[PDB]
Design brief:
Radius of gyration of chain A: 15 Å
Number of strands of chain A: 0
Strand content of chain C: under 5%
Largest sheet of chain C: none
Distance between the termini of chain C: 61 Å
Protein name (chain B): ATP synthase peripheral stalk subunit b, mitochondrial
Distance between the termini of chain A: 31 Å
Organism (chain B): Bos taurus (Bovine)
Family (chain B): Belongs to the eukaryotic ATPase B chain family.
Shape of chain C: rod-shaped
Modified residues (N6-acetyllysine) (chain B): 6, 21, 29
Oligomer: part of a larger assembly
CATH architecture of chain A: Up-down Bundle
Number of helices of chain C: 5
CATH class of chain A: Mainly Alpha
Subcellular location (chain B): Mitochondrion; Mitochondrion inner membrane
Structural class of chain C: mainly alpha
Chains: A mainly alpha, B mainly alpha, C mainly alpha, E mainly alpha, F mainly alpha
CATH superfamily of chain A: ATP synthase alpha/beta chain, C-terminal domain
Helix content of chain A: over 70%
């Protein structure tokens, strides 16, 4: 709920305007972001076949995008990120993942970590 | 008069601060680098021993 | 053997890039991860074997008994260093960092501080 | 097999999730237990694939020792060629989710009432 | 139609030939999107192909999508990139056309074999836009991709 | 036509509808801006005509 609520909603909005244009272009930035993001989110709801996931990861990665992070990122490399990141938090922040799992939820603190993790991780993922 | 004193003020402390910060970093980071390499090595081998056991038992 | 256990500070590493080892770092992240995440998943041992009960139900007999005794009596090889001089190649380049570079550098650094005092004053 | 549907009082609503690992699904239609949900889509949507990865997902849940987070899986195959099934099974085998799993398999060959019946049967088992 | 509807279950790979495509004169005249395999899904063909195809599928579909634009705007009008992709789709389409040994009588050109690697690769190149400089109908009714290239020369 | 066909139709008619709409607002978006932008400009070009305007 914490990550998704907004997203469900976002996708909704995204979707009508997702449907709009794409006429080799689109128009205002606001929406352009939503699209960019959206597109990302689309990847986020994606998943290859033979690839079921754990909720904490899922929430996690979603959290990233939601938190407006990878909307910068460009689509093939999202996928790439996603992996990298995922194995990363698993690796590193299994601790944290542990926490989130534990709390059964993100905690603002878990978030704070996550975000932090992410931001750097993201940074590493990129640069 | 007063301009040059504060101007020199920044520049002289700058070259220090930066160099003492550079010095402190390299010690721990260079020991970390060494460390991490040892890390990566050890892993692989226990893996190599581990893998053989699974393989032959199969 | 084991595992090296050690510490990774990512903004530190990556930035370091003394040219003669720089390249390794950029690659070195990606190489390490391969091992890291992989090993975390696998198990190290497989199942075990009750040779007697299986043997009793085999009809090409005494073969299982042969393999059984030989297996239990047997030890597999191990895998071994090409390089534990690298271990030391560090302390030498660490001499490079400190004494050689440290001292002459340190002196310059200190002086500027004291210098700055007076040129604030 | 003749078993009553639970009474109102016997019923109790959901408060439970349940996951499938499908990012999208668990996100946007966050998975619950005790329910019913139409999975709908065309031929080889990986239709089955979609389901499979979910089943696979339950592995962790059967490793997820909360008992109401351990799931005994029931797969009703209606009119499903043995070959297909063989594959399916084959996946399941690989996944050996099968250990906590009944696979009721009614390939097209089965006489029609049998095929008809099978779900109810499956149903009985799940009740 | 119920029958085919049923039918599908029993199948392993379904090749649905697109009469529309046929109608495009195309030969092989397939419905590519429905030239399919349950022995296809990402690893049931594996992804190169799959993806290449997904890209491909995407581009044609998208080309369909773009048709909609064109429906307003024209035979040479859109965003250029889109034009590339369109073209790529039109080319790809053509590259999919292949002579027939059987119907060499009809076609006037004997069928081809592009053994798979050269096949995947073939498209992969086009996808790589390698050929782009090249023209589409030079790919029409070809086997091996080079021969299409060759054919371009043969045009001019 | 036969109902399918009708739908076949419809599908696209909507698509069209959208598409038309797409342009509509899109154009309008461009427009929306554009009209505003006309101010200094308008004036400006109107300006351009100075001279004959007079002499």
């Amino acid at each position: 709920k914490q990550v998704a609520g907004t997203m469900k909603l976002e996708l909704a909005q995204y979707r009508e305007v997702a449907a709009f244009a794409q006429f080799g272009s689109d128009l205002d930035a606001a929406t352009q972001q939503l699209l960019s993001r959206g597109v990302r989110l689309t990847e986020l709801l994606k998943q290859g076949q033979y690839s079921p996931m754990a909720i904490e990861e899922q929430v996690a990665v979603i959290y990233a995008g939601v938190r407006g992070y990878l909307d910068k990122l460009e689509p093939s490399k999202i996928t790439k990120f996603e992996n990298a990141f995922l194995s990363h938090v698993i690796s590193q922040h299994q601790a944290l993942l542990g926490k989130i799992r534990t709390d059964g939820k993100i905690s603002e603190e878990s978030d704070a970590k996550l975000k932090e993790i992410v931001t750097n991780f993201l940074a590493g993922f990129e640069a | 008069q007063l301009e040059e004193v504060k101007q020199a003020s920044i520049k002289q402390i700058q070259d220090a601060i930066d160099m003492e910060k550079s010095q402190q970093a390299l010690v721990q980071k260079r020991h970390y680098l060494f460390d991490v390499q040892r890390n990566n090595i050890a892993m692989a081998l226990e893996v190599t021993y581990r893998e053989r056991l699974h393989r032959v038992y199969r | 053997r084991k595992l090296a256990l050690k510490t990774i500070d990512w903004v530190a590493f990556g930035e370091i890039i003394p040219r003669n080892q720089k390249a390794v770092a950029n690659s070195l992240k990606s190489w390490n991860e391969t091992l890291t995440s992989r090993l975390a998943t696998l198990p190290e041992k497989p199942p075990a074997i009750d040779w007697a009960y299986y043997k009793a139900n085999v009809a090409k007999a005494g073969l299982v008994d042969d393999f059984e005794k030989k297996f239990n009596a047997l030890k597999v090889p191990i895998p071994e260093d090409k390089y534990t001089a690298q271990v030391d190649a560090e302390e030498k380049e660490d001499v490079k960092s400190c004494a050689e570079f440290l001292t002459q550098s340190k002196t310059r650094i200190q002086e500027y501080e004291k210098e700055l005092e007076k040129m604030r004053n | 097999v003749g078993l009553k549907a639970p009474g109102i009082i016997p019923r109790i609503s959901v408060r439970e999730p349940m996951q499938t690992g499908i990012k999208a699904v668990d996100s946007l239609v966050p998975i619950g237990r005790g329910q019913r949900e139409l999975i709908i889509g065309d031929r080889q949507t990986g239709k089955t694939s979609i389901a499979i990865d979910t089943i696979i997902n339950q592995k962790r849940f059967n490793d997820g020792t909360d008992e109401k987070k351990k799931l005994y899986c029931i797969y009703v195959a209606i009119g499903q060629k043995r070959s297909t099934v063989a594959q399916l099974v084959k996946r399941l085998t690989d996944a050996d989710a099968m250990k906590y799993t009944i696979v009721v398999s009614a390939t097209a060959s089965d006489a029609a009432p049998l095929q008809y019946l099978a779900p109810y049967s499956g149903c009985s088992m799940g009740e | 139609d119920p029958a085919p509807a049923t039918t599908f279950a029993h199948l392993d790979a379904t090749t649905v030939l697109s009469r529309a495509i046929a109608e495009l004169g195309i030969y092989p005249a397939v419905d590519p999107l429905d030239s399919t395999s349950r022995i296809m899904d990402p690893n049931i063909v594996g992804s190169e192909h799959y993806d290449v195809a997904r890209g491909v599928q995407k581009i044609l579909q998208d080309y369909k999508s773009l048709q909609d634009i064109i429906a307003i705007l024209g035979m040479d009008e859109l965003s250029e990139e889109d034009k590339l992709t369109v073209s790529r789709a039109r080319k790809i389409q053509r590259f999919l056309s292949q002579p027939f040994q059987v119907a060499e009588v009809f076609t006037g050109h004997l069928g081809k074999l592009v053994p798979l690697k050269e096949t995947i690769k073939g498209f992969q190149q086009i996808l790589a836009g390698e050929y782009d400089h090249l023209p589409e109908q030079a790919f029409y009714m070809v086997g091996p991709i080079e021969e299409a290239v060759a054919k371009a020369d043969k045009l001019a | 036509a036969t109902l399918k066909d009708i739908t076949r139709r419809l599908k696209s008619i909507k698509n069209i509808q959208k598409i038309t709409k797409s342009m509509k607002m899109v154009a309008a978006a461009k427009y929306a801006r554009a009209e505003r932008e006309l101010k200094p400009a308008r004036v400006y070009g109107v300006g351009s005509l100075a001279l004959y305007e007079k002499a």
